[PDB]
Amino acid sequence: PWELTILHTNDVHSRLEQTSEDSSKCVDASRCMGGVARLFTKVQQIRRAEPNVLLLDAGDQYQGTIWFTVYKGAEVAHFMNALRYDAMALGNHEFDNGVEGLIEPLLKEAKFPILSANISASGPLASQISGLYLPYKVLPVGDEVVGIVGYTSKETPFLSNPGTNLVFEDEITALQPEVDKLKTLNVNKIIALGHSGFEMDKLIAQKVRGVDVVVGGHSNTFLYTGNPPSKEVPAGKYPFIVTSDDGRKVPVVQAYAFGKYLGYLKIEFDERGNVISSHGNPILLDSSIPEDPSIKADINKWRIKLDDYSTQELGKTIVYLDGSSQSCRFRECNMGNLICDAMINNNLRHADEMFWNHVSMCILNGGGIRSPIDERNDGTITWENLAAVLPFGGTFDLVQLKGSTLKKAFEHSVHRYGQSTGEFLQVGGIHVVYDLSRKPGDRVVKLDVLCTSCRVPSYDPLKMDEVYKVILPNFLANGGDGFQMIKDELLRHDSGDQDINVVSTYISKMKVIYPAVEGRIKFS
Amino acid sequence: PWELTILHTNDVHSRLEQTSEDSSKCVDASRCMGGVARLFTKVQQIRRAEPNVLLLDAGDQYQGTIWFTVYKGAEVAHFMNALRYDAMALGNHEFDNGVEGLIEPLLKEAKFPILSANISASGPLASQISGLYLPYKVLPVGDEVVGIVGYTSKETPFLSNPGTNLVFEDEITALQPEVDKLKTLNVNKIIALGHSGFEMDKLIAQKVRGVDVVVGGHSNTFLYTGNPPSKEVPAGKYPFIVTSDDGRKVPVVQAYAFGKYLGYLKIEFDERGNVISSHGNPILLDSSIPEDPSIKADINKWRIKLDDYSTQELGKTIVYLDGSSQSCRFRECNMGNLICDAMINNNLRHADEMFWNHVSMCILNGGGIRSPIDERNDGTITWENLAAVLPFGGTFDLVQLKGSTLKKAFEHSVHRYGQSTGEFLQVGGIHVVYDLSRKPGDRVVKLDVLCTSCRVPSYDPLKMDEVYKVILPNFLANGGDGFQMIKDELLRHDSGDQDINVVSTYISKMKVIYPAVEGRIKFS
Ligand SMILES: Nc1nc2c(ncn2[C@@H]2O[C@H](COP(=O)(O)O)[C@@H](O)[C@H]2O)c(=O)[nH]1
Ligand SMILES: Nc1nc2c(ncn2[C@@H]2O[C@H](COP(=O)(O)O)[C@@H](O)[C@H]2O)c(=O)[nH]1
Ligand SMILES: [Ca+2]
Ligand SMILES: [Ca+2]
Ligand SMILES: [Zn+2]
Ligand SMILES: [Zn+2]
Ligand SMILES: [Zn+2]
Ligand SMILES: [Zn+2]
């Protein structure tokens, strides 16, 4: 039997440096985790011990910290090249800076193949990008070969900025003929590496004949066999076994997100490329693993430009930005309005004739707003200033919520009003009126929302059975601040852009801001 | 006696081409007026006939039409040079593109002196601008000399974009010592040429000892002796005689605006430079005066780049821009909101610690909105598109109105509601609620306005005795659409930027717009 060790990462999201346990800024170095210098140590150890190793990434290196803001993917090519990745699939966030921001910094500079079988280009773009990403690559591994076939979320156009010259095909439709072709070329060991989420990964394992292993991402899915090593709760066993339509057992793996874990799967193959066995587990990259000194020194050299950028003017405010708890946990606050307006601006994506934009609505817990910004520093706003407002290292995510769910969220917003608690919601594209004289759970007396399926945006009453797209912090999507109804009732969740980065981009675009308090939230 | 002919223009405001009677686009060429080619003909005729002629401009050549949008003052230097102006005073609108947009295109390229005695620079700007404008110039005229001393509105910082490195001094304070100095230099014939308005011009004539003649501007003041030649109603005789504090009779002149008239004043001086007599009248530049063919051919060559620019993309909309009468004469319309938001953005000026901005409020007659813009031309918005929305060649002016006046305007807005009449007001920085079941004059049931004297903009009830700054069309400032209360009760009026140009700049800054209908106007 021929044994292959698959090492894999996904959704690293710009965590070049080691992190806290929750993947935010490292504060207590002795308890920090992940980062590329530590990953290097572990990958190097494994490659000393195991003859046949592939190191794969299932996409979404782009977006997540100031590294991406400043280096715009140059850091991804540089550090993934230093770690000698063997292949990467395109994720949705690889399109955040458009096609041009993918071609240059990543596709031209990577020393490994970049894969996606389900993305096609037309017009001049097709000639410009031809061969810079591939449907698959056949890689030599010892005396054998392994085909790796890529895929990317069909939903990328709603979740990034790929432009109108790329088409994202159904994954299974695109993958089957490539896997078929590899069979005709005597490639009997096939890994599907891609970025569509655990649910699609299981359908691929089930339906794509000839796929031996699925290495996925996008859904930040933690899988584990045994007692978990940290705070992440497993969604299932590692690997997750799918029984394929042709009767095979196909392992499906993912490795959470943020470079906290290294995925590690050992596969035994027979001489015909059938999987005989698969086992493994992600490896927690905790402080017991040293950071590689050479990689760490290069990280610290690249950090200089980050420190320089963090104090540069992004733009100006002519108004006090009231991020005080005394405002933002009690009433509409102009910092809340600014951040929600930045969230909606970030989620402007290419529109059908069926909507002016796919999403119009925003909610933001006032407890997530951690500082005001004073306008009397000649109006300057810096990244450092925004990092005081938004210090948790979160994202602004896209969810789909029934109106009934959102009305329950707005009741939760004021259920214990008057105690300076974090759950009070700031808004965009929503007008709410509370009557605090009513019983908790019955305080919302008007709730109007900005239409999407309309040529002129206007407000209509919220409908209980309608499903709304809403931009909100990951903290709330995950049921933080007691918003269990959001976690338990949401119909869709996709992780979005770094919180600070969303606001910094909007302020840079606007150049001079003057957000008002304007009656998005009223009390009767 | 030594006779001087003073020819003068003021507030030409980018009317390079001949105009309609109302100074808008020329439609019936046989009835058109003004323009630089016609002015050239008349000035050339006068210079053949009169030995001692000065041609003066009292400022505000900048701003008014697409000429200024595209050529940014190069057209002013070029055509004023072709007409051989002898001197120009700086107006407020010469600062619309900042100090840099004055130095380059106008101060460096003009072949005549540019004057202002009451503007001082500090820091590096002082060295950069030194001598590029002057307090005064002594000009040879035949065998004599005439001193011309300039001045500019002290209010320029509220009415343009001069920046924080220029100080505008009290006119009379600055002028007196310059006029004194010219006396010590044996210059006994002194013209004050400047841009502060008729009321300040009369104070200058009264109080500045040694000024023989005041040639003014800014207030678009029409003065005439006799039966007026066109639709402009004279504010007084031409010249307007002020009795000075030293007992002299000092003529004060102005020549309306928009190049419609050439001011023409004949002064007789004795050998000591005392005015013995003054007489004249502005000359209506009507179609009986031919356009100079050489100037007209140069105008038509410069027009090519205007035509090219008029169809270029300024920016995009992802929403239908509803400028329909069925919306904008009956309820809040998103085109109205866009134009009002552009008006407020245009009037962001350098703020004290006493206000976030000096003005927060906007009203716009819905009858002044003349077209929608469809978003389905790939979202493109062109100048040509904006010219269909705003076809009247007006300005967005700054006024000061008591709250009582503004409440009366909002009653007038709905006095005969339901007939698709033009007076219905679109708004910015104002939230109004009507109850149309009430009697005309008593339909406004809530009227809240955005604060200025506040660090966080928020809405407060309108106060009847408070004076508010409001941006509004010149048509309304002048009492159009039956808004006689605005004309009759306003405390201040200053002419602002060209309507199309205000909106085009805002759309270019924003790049992608999506104005909503959001409850600025409601009905109970
Ligand atoms: N986004 C986000 N907000 C958080 C997080 N932890 C706490 N919060 C917010 O901070 C509040 C607690 O703040 P105080 O300790 O200041 O009261 C919570 O109610 C919540 O609104 C986090 O990890 N992410
Ligand atoms: N700004 C401005 N609006 C005007 C002018 N003349 C008319 N209007 C507007 O057009 C309306 C008349 O339009 P109708 O003819 O389309 O009904 C007036 O009520 C007024 O609102 C003008 O010279 N300038
Ligand atoms: Ca196989
Ligand atoms: Ca004199
Ligand atoms: Zn991701
Ligand atoms: Zn993803
Ligand atoms: Zn003017
Ligand atoms: Zn002026």
PDB file of C-alpha atoms in Angstrom, chain A residues 318-320 322 334 341 344-345 348 353 356-357 374-376 431 450 455-459 509-510 512 514-518 522, chain B residues 318-320 322 334 341 344-345 348 353 356-357 374-376 431 450 455-459 509-510 512 514-518 522:
ATOM      1  CA  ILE A 318     -15.825  66.869  10.672  1.00  0.00           C
ATOM      2  CA  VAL A 319     -18.124  65.388  13.403  1.00  0.00           C
ATOM      3  CA  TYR A 320     -17.399  63.742  16.722  1.00  0.00           C
ATOM      4  CA  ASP A 322     -19.819  59.008  19.192  1.00  0.00           C
ATOM      5  CA  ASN A 334     -23.578  58.212  14.858  1.00  0.00           C
ATOM      6  CA  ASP A 341     -23.254  52.361   6.346  1.00  0.00           C
ATOM      7  CA  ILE A 344     -23.722  48.013   3.420  1.00  0.00           C
ATOM      8  CA  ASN A 345     -21.188  49.767   1.144  1.00  0.00           C
ATOM      9  CA  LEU A 348     -22.449  46.287  -2.929  1.00  0.00           C
ATOM     10  CA  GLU A 353     -32.382  43.942 -13.071  1.00  0.00           C
ATOM     11  CA  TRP A 356     -30.586  47.561  -6.834  1.00  0.00           C
ATOM     12  CA  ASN A 357     -28.310  45.522  -4.469  1.00  0.00           C
ATOM     13  CA  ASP A 374     -12.517  62.713  18.476  1.00  0.00           C
ATOM     14  CA  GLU A 375     -12.606  65.035  15.405  1.00  0.00           C
ATOM     15  CA  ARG A 376     -10.233  67.603  16.966  1.00  0.00           C
ATOM     16  CA  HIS A 431     -36.145  51.948  11.007  1.00  0.00           C
ATOM     17  CA  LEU A 450     -35.188  49.047   2.995  1.00  0.00           C
ATOM     18  CA  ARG A 455     -35.307  50.251  -8.467  1.00  0.00           C
ATOM     19  CA  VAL A 456     -35.819  53.062  -5.941  1.00  0.00           C
ATOM     20  CA  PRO A 457     -34.844  52.007  -2.385  1.00  0.00           C
ATOM     21  CA  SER A 458     -37.672  52.761   0.067  1.00  0.00           C
ATOM     22  CA  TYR A 459     -38.887  51.397   3.401  1.00  0.00           C
ATOM     23  CA  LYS A 509     -13.603  56.198  -0.253  1.00  0.00           C
ATOM     24  CA  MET A 510     -15.671  59.005   1.405  1.00  0.00           C
ATOM     25  CA  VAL A 512     -14.626  63.409   4.600  1.00  0.00           C
ATOM     26  CA  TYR A 514     -20.165  63.566   8.806  1.00  0.00           C
ATOM     27  CA  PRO A 515     -22.556  60.849  10.034  1.00  0.00           C
ATOM     28  CA  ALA A 516     -25.683  62.119  11.799  1.00  0.00           C
ATOM     29  CA  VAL A 517     -28.190  60.668  14.241  1.00  0.00           C
ATOM     30  CA  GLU A 518     -31.282  60.700  12.032  1.00  0.00           C
ATOM     31  CA  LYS A 522     -36.891  55.991  18.000  1.00  0.00           C
TER      32      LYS A 522
ATOM     33  CA  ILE B 318     -27.217  51.456  -9.049  1.00  0.00           C
ATOM     34  CA  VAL B 319     -30.739  52.905  -8.391  1.00  0.00           C
ATOM     35  CA  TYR B 320     -33.281  54.540 -10.652  1.00  0.00           C
ATOM     36  CA  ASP B 322     -36.664  59.242  -9.745  1.00  0.00           C
ATOM     37  CA  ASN B 334     -34.758  60.027  -4.332  1.00  0.00           C
ATOM     38  CA  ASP B 341     -27.246  65.922  -0.381  1.00  0.00           C
ATOM     39  CA  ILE B 344     -24.970  70.280   1.492  1.00  0.00           C
ATOM     40  CA  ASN B 345     -21.725  68.559   0.404  1.00  0.00           C
ATOM     41  CA  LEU B 348     -18.835  72.048   3.530  1.00  0.00           C
ATOM     42  CA  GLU B 353     -14.942  74.359  17.187  1.00  0.00           C
ATOM     43  CA  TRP B 356     -19.448  70.725  12.527  1.00  0.00           C
ATOM     44  CA  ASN B 357     -20.397  72.772   9.390  1.00  0.00           C
ATOM     45  CA  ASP B 374     -32.404  55.602 -15.759  1.00  0.00           C
ATOM     46  CA  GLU B 375     -29.758  53.294 -14.176  1.00  0.00           C
ATOM     47  CA  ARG B 376     -29.922  50.739 -17.023  1.00  0.00           C
ATOM     48  CA  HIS B 431     -37.669  66.204   8.528  1.00  0.00           C
ATOM     49  CA  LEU B 450     -30.254  69.151  11.667  1.00  0.00           C
ATOM     50  CA  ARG B 455     -20.336  68.004  17.426  1.00  0.00           C
ATOM     51  CA  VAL B 456     -22.762  65.175  16.610  1.00  0.00           C
ATOM     52  CA  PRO B 457     -25.381  66.221  14.010  1.00  0.00           C
ATOM     53  CA  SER B 458     -28.903  65.432  15.255  1.00  0.00           C
ATOM     54  CA  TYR B 459     -32.414  66.769  14.672  1.00  0.00           C
ATOM     55  CA  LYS B 509     -16.710  62.199  -5.532  1.00  0.00           C
ATOM     56  CA  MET B 510     -19.149  59.367  -4.567  1.00  0.00           C
ATOM     57  CA  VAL B 512     -21.374  54.956  -7.075  1.00  0.00           C
ATOM     58  CA  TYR B 514     -27.765  54.732  -4.337  1.00  0.00           C
ATOM     59  CA  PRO B 515     -30.036  57.422  -2.852  1.00  0.00           C
ATOM     60  CA  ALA B 516     -33.105  56.117  -1.010  1.00  0.00           C
ATOM     61  CA  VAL B 517     -36.479  57.535  -0.029  1.00  0.00           C
ATOM     62  CA  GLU B 518     -36.085  57.488   3.750  1.00  0.00           C
ATOM     63  CA  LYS B 522     -44.083  62.120   5.703  1.00  0.00           C
TER      64      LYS B 522
END
